[PDB]
């Protein structure tokens, strides 16, 4: 209401609204480059620090097992999984901001979705341990009942491997966990392959159509375990694959890597012209 | 030693490419070329539609998808027969047929999700007497977007059937990582 | 005989649905020229000045123009 007619160029020009808002800085550099690139730079720095810490503890492990470490080294530091700087940054963020397996079990009273909690083990650990138990028991019982030795040899022999895989899958955040899930998948895939290709010797019958290798309950259970491994977790040890071709490194920006693949694949002396 | 409250969750490298910016996530076919939300965004901020094609197919390929294995060696033949071995005309008519079939299966899944909402209300009445008879719309969208594991579905259904508690939901299922077995796949 | 001719006609119709070049990416292993694919260059023996005239006439006939 006539807030004009008092607008002075000498005493300062002001509107009726008392100032727009405050100003948020979040750092001079982050003012300079903005977000989505401060975030990208922060993620790159965090990932590189974690990679450097993992490489440092692997190399320190290799040197401490060699007895080539100074006297101040504590091997318990190798149990520090996170990078120390990233751990400090997460402390800063959190300080400026604020049926009976696997774990426990509550059964329709409190914490109803307790099986989905991360207990530290693979989801298929009790499944592969139960399959090992029923395979060993069924093989022993079949060999006792019939006299064929393929049920006990392909019974307890695979059950021990599945039990070792289930032991290795009790901490499914490590190289033993990845190796255990791969070994369990290999054993179950071998069971499925034998069942649907060769068959079971004690199931040999008179007629050729009665022999019929087929896919019975054991092969179904092993294939279901295989699908369970694939659909829960198998990633890990993905660095183990076939060696890279010269077709991978044709457009690679690394002359040294391209020449290494060139020399390893027998070419070697072909002119690079890059 | 430097334990930061929350137990350190190791952040492994991604094994699958992130889903495209034109995706729906609901088994419905995506749009033909343009994902139709760009018209509700400003121009020259829709630059991230081609910045999804880049870094989904050129610059941010996960190294788990560049692995050379026997299965990928076999699968290159299927992809080569699909792309350079089959005419684009037949590929186009098969693409139209798959689009129509996927629309039909999306309508079927939507009707199934609505019936699962009705079953949610029924199980929430049998278990809380007659008081709670609603259903969780967030869980309805979670079923529609395939964010639930079968174990989570069974646990939630059992939870409704014997204590009620519609708005107490199971955790969202993590994406399935790409399986790797050495040189095999 | 109709079944055999129908198989041949199905192959020909598949090639017709292929039609041209559209839908196919360029290939660095298979360029469109065999001289690119192999390593074939003219050198000191064989090339002569008149060969430019003959090359011009062959290229005119290959392009389809009756000029030389």
């Amino acid at each position: 209401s006539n807030w004009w007619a008092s607008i002075n160029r000498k005493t300062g020009i002001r509107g009726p609204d008392p100032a727009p808002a405050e100003e948020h800085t979040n750092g001079p550099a982050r003012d300079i480059i903005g977000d989505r690139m401060s975030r990208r730079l922060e993620d790159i720095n965090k990932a590189e620090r974690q990679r450097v810490w993992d490489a440092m503890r692997v190399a320190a492990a290799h040197r401490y097992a060699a007895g080539q470490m100074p006297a101040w080294f504590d091997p318990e530091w190798l149990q520090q999984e996170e990078a120390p700087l990233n751990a400090m940054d997460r402390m800063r963020g959190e300080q400026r901001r604020i049926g009976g397996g696997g774990g426990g079990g509550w059964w329709r009273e409190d914490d109803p979705y307790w099986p989905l909690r991360d207990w530290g083990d693979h989801p298929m650990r009790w499944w592969t341990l139960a399959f090992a138990a029923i395979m060993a028991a069924g093989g022993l019982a079949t060999s006792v009942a019939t006299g064929y030795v393929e049920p006990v040899q392909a019974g307890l022999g695979a059950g021990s491997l599945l039990a070792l895989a289930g032991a290795a899958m009790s901490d499914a955040r490590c190289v033993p966990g990845a190796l255990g899930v791969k070994l369990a998948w290999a054993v179950c895939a071998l069971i499925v392959l034998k069942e649907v290709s060769v068959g079971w010797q004690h199931k040999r019958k008179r007629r050729l159509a009665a022999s019929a290798p087929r896919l019975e309950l054991t092969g179904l259970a092993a294939a279901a375990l295989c699908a369970g491994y694939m659909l829960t977790d198998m990633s890990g040890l993905g660095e183990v694959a076939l060696p890279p071709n010269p077709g991978a490194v044709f457009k690679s920006p690394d002359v040294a890597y391209r020449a290494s693949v060139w020399q390893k694949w027998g070419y070697g002396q072909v002119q690079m012209r890059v | 030693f430097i334990s930061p409250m929350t137990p350190y969750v190791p952040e492994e490298e991604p094994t699958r490419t992130p889903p495209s910016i034109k995706d729906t996530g609901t088994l419905r076919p995506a749009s033909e070329w343009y994902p139709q939300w760009m018209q509700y965004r400003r121009r020259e901020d829709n630059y991230v539609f081609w910045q999804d094609k880049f870094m989904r197919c050129s610059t941010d390929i996960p190294w788990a998808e560049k692995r050379w294995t026997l299965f990928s060696t076999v699968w290159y033949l299927v992809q080569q027969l699909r792309f350079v071995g089959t005419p684009p005309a037949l590929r186009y008519v098969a693409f139209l047929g798959w689009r129509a079939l996927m629309f039909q299966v999306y309508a079927a899944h939507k009707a199934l999700v609505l019936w699962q909402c009705k079953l949610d209300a029924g199980l929430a009445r049998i278990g809380s007497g007659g008081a709670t008879a609603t259903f969780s719309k967030t869980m309805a969208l979670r079923r529609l977007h395939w964010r639930n594991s079968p174990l989570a579905e069974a646990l939630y259904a059992l939870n409704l059937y014997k204590t009620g508690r519609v708005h107490l939901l199971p955790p969202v299922a993590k994406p399935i990582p790409r399986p790797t077995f050495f040189w095999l796949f | 005989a109709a079944v055999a001719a129908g198989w041949h006609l199905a192959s020909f119709a598949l090639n017709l649905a292929f039609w041209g070049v559209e839908g196919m990416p360029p290939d660095r292993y298979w360029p469109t020229s065999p001289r690119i694919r192999l390593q074939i260059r003219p050198g000191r023996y064989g090339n002569m000045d008149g060969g430019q005239r003959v090359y011009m006439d062959y290229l005119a006939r290959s392009e389809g123009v009756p000029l030389n």
Binding site: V196, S197, P213, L215 | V74, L77, V78, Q80, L81 | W30, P34, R37, L38
Partner: peptide, 29 residues
């Protein structure tokens, strides 16, 4: 099992190798 399962990758590989071999036969001619 295995009937049209150990055949389809092998027939796929044979078709691909045969086509590349015809192209390379043109190349060597």
């Amino acid at each position: 099992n295995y009937q049209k399962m150990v055949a389809f990758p092998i027939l796929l590989s044979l078709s691909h190798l045969l086509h590349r071999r015809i192209l390379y036969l043109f190349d060597t001619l």
